[PDB]
Design a binder for this molecule. Structure first.
Ligand SMILES: Nc1ncnc2c1ncn2[C@@H]1O[C@H](COP(=O)(O)O)[C@@H](O)[C@H]1O
Ligand SMILES: Nc1ncnc2c1ncn2[C@@H]1O[C@H](COP(=O)(O)O)[C@@H](O)[C@H]1O
Ligand SMILES: [Zn+2]
Ligand SMILES: [Zn+2]
Lengths: 111, 111
């Protein structure tokens, strides 16, 4: 009812869809920082990486596996995966999302 | 015998250790790009995220869980987790390593 990414996952708010299945939903970042910039979310609401538990760690491993399958397909020359937790990382939406970044030789600059 | 991170994990090459257990090894990046910059590796040799399989996905979930435990302790104000796969991402060592970055409001710049 409230979470922007939960709603995107249920196609209640529009997105450019890259992949979806019963468990995950991947779509293009609307403000990209690389030529390929994809967000991968679980459909289920998990607020951040700090909400991973010993009991859901297998599920998050499966999400990361599916992140790799998307990345190796969309970015055969290589890709970077980023996850932001909390204020210093600039986490905006409190629904866990993996960034897949690629399509160029990606910078590695001081943060 | 050959992999720099396998050797660091077995303390055959020195590092500044942040945490270790029977499964993982975490140490300070020697060329940091943030005030807190930690590398977390499995002790077992896995070359990159592209080597995750349906059969080891639970293990990688556990590694990511332990990444979150390290991050929330070392970076209570928030942290970014990064993984680089292949040439465009600039992956140097072919032994999977998660970057934990924090200690400041981290930039989000074009790559
Ligand atoms: N409605 C949206 N559709 C697609 N991407 C979005 C939308 N709203 C925010 N984003 C992206 O979501 C990301 C949030 O990343 P983070 O800083 O890790 O919370 C940013 O890269 C935003 O550009
Ligand atoms: N001997 C070392 N000890 C600690 N960190 C290292 C060492 N060699 C390389 N690194 C770091 O490992 C990281 C490799 O990251 P990547 O570009 O993702 O392959 C870089 O941030 C390097 O500064
Ligand atoms: Zn949500
Ligand atoms: Zn190794």
């Amino acid at each position: 009812d409230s979470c922007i990414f939960c709603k995107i996952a249920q196609k209640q708010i529009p997105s450019t869809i890259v992949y979806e299945d019963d468990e995950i939903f991947a779509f293009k970042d609307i403000n990209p920082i690389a030529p390929i910039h994809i967000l991968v979310i679980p459909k289920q609401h998990i607020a951040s990486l700090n909400e991973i538990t010993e009991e859901n760690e297998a599920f998050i491993g499966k999400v990361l596996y599916k992140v790799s399958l998307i990345g190796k397909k969309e970015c055969p020359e290589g890709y970077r995966v980023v996850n932001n937790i909390g204020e210093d990382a600039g986490q905006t939406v409190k629904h866990i999302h993996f960034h897949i970044l690629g399509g160029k030789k990606l910078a590695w600059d001081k943060l």
